[PDB]
């Protein structure tokens, strides 16, 4: 304990990781747990699995040291297609979705503040992400000045809500007793509870190119991911509590803006207002910087061959030093997503692509540790099998109940990562454009 | 407070051998990612190649994989930059850049020092 140099990379754990997603997806996980004791698991587990996955993924993320991350880690591993397939899907459904899911939550929120109506959440979801598309081509001037701030002000509108929310008058540990209902049996209920919860868990995946960026890195280095992750797992579990000391299971599940409601118990008037003000800025700063680490990827294809008009993605604008073709690509399949999927069915797609990949990548540490057991390993995963194997374990397990569970989800996905198999092959011959 | 000066780079003919070079403040340097990136006279920037701290990692771009090897000098505070087979179509100012963190970068954005740059024409 007290490195005091890692203190500042725990900042950044919590912070990649915490954001907009206790604020929206109570509704997805008390809507199929059905109970207030399994939804609470559901968010134990998924981050006991993201500290595992976490300590996995550095491995390969110290034996890579680069920036790019998974898309090397698989190419390195898996052969150029599958640090291919990884972008692939990045760039046409991870990426896209992530702004488009939490635009659609953004606007949604909006008319629950703002009362306005139900019809104008779309035209609001659409403006946004356009908004901060543009706005992100003005330059990390701005683009990180959105972030500066959504990063102190989403820190606020939690703890001012686990204060007040187990602290609410009718409360304690009854307020969430039904441990498993039948209306919602406890199998086919975990699998879409994990999904749900993984979700706010989301860019946990960033520690490999952390670990990267590091120096000397065992030291601390499995101790920011252990207390960072926990710390973000002991802030979801405890804000949760707050959340059924006020409203409960049934009810969380009711509107689709859960805090939003819990807000304005808490607090009386202007009060519960600048905490939902506190929400709008936490979605906002996420949208923006999804689409900051987002023009990362279309042109890291056009690095290669890997994509059609490889030239014309690859453009830096000589002012700004972005690519900016990238994210007009990503705007525009965003907008599709925001015109034809809902909230919850884009951050479900979100939980079993990535992690479609993601298992590739812990069973790649394992793989890399039978392929070159010489390699340079400045960090290595310890509790050597157990560990990857339990991220594995999983892993596995949420990209088999997704497909059994959402069907047209595990296939939309899958047309979309599998329809850039063409891609890869017509622009390695013909090397883009 | 990263001052970086590029060598070397200058006119050469069609299928020889440049070898580029890169001085860095220092301190730093040996904790820091570097890379070499190259800017065409109607282009921006585009990537050309990038090295871990520790020299472990190195990447390098479609067109230039195969003739060009980044390497650096950590002793010396330096990156350099062996071209080879050199094309026409490699003309351009080969800035070297800076960055924090061991982690290689093909992204521009993350390079926070830059080079003035060496010009280079390759001719036939």
């Known amino acids: 304990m007290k490195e005091v140099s890692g203190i500042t990379a725990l900042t950044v754990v919590v912070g990649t990781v915490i954001g907009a997603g206790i604020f929206f997806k109570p509704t997805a996980v008390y809507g199929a747990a059905g109970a207030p004791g399994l939804g609470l698991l559901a968010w134990f587990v998924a981050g006991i699995i993201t500290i595992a996955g976490g300590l996995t993924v550095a491995e390969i993320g110290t034996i890579y040291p680069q920036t790019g991350g998974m898309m090397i880690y698989l190419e390195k591993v898996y052969g150029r297609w599958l640090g291919f397939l990884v972008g692939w899907a990045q760039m046409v459904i991870y990426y896209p979705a992530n702004i488009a899911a939490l635009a659609i939550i953004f606007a949604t929120q909006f008319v629950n503040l703002f009362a306005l109506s139900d019809s104008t959440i779309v035209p609001t979801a659409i403006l946004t992400s356009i908004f901060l598309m543009g706005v992100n081509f003005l330059g990390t001037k701005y683009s990180g000045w959105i972030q500066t701030l959504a990063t102190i002000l989403k820190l606020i509108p939690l703890v001012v809500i686990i204060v007040a929310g187990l602290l609410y008058p009718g409360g304690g540990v009854i307020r969430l007793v039904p441990f498993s209902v039948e209306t919602h049996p406890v199998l086919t209920s975990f699998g879409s509870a994990l999904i749900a919860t993984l979700f706010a868990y989301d860019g946990w995946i960033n520690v490999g190119t952390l670990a990267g960026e590091m120096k000397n890195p065992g030291k601390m280095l499995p101790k920011v991911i252990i207390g960072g992750l926990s710390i973000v797992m002991a802030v979801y579990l405890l804000t949760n509590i707050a959340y059924l000391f006020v409203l409960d299971s049934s009810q969380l599940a009711g509107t689709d803006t859960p805090a939003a409601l819990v807000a304005s118990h808490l607090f009386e008037g202007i009060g519960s207002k600048l905490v939902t003000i506190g929400i709008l800025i936490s979605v906002f700063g996420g949208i923006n910087g999804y689409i900051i680490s987002g023009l990362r990827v279309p042109y890291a294809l056009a690095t290669q061959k890997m994509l059609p008009f490889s030239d014309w993605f690859a453009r830096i604008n000589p002012k700004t030093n972005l690519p900016i073709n990238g994210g007009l690509v990503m705007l525009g399949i965003a907008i599709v997503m925001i015109l034809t999927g809902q909230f919850n069915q884009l951050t479900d797609l979100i939980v079993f692509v990535i992690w479609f990949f993601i298992t590739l990548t812990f069973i790649a540490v394992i793989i890399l540790r039978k392929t070159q057991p010489d390699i340079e390993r400045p960090y290595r995963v310890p509790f050597y099998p157990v560990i990857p194997l339990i991220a594995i374990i999983g892993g596995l397990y949420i990209i088999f109940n997704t497909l059994i569970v959402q069907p047209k989800n595990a296939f939309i996905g899958i047309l979309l990562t599998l329809i850039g198999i063409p891609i890869y092959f017509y622009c390695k011959k013909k090397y883009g454009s | 407070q990263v001052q970086l000066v590029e060598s070397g780079g200058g006119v050469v003919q069609a299928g020889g051998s440049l070898r580029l070079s890169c001085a860095a403040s220092?301190?730093?340097?040996?904790?820091?990612?570097m890379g070499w990136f190259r800017q065409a006279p109607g282009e921006g920037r585009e990537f050309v190649a990038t090295?871990?701290?520790?020299?472990?990692?190195?990447e390098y771009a479609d067109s230039v994989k195969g003739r060009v090897t980044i390497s650096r000098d950590n002793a010396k505070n330096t990156v350099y930059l062996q071209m080879n087979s050199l094309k026409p179509g490699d003309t351009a100012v080969y800035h070297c850049?800076?960055?924090?963190?061991?982690?290689?970068?093909?992204?521009?954005?993350?390079?926070?020092?830059w080079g003035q740059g060496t010009q280079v024409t390759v001719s036939s």
């Open positions: 850049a800076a960055k924090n963190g061991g982690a290689a970068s093909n992204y521009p954005n993350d390079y926070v020092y």
């Open positions: 220092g301190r730093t340097f040996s904790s820091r990612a």
């Open positions: 090295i871990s701290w520790s020299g472990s990692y190195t």
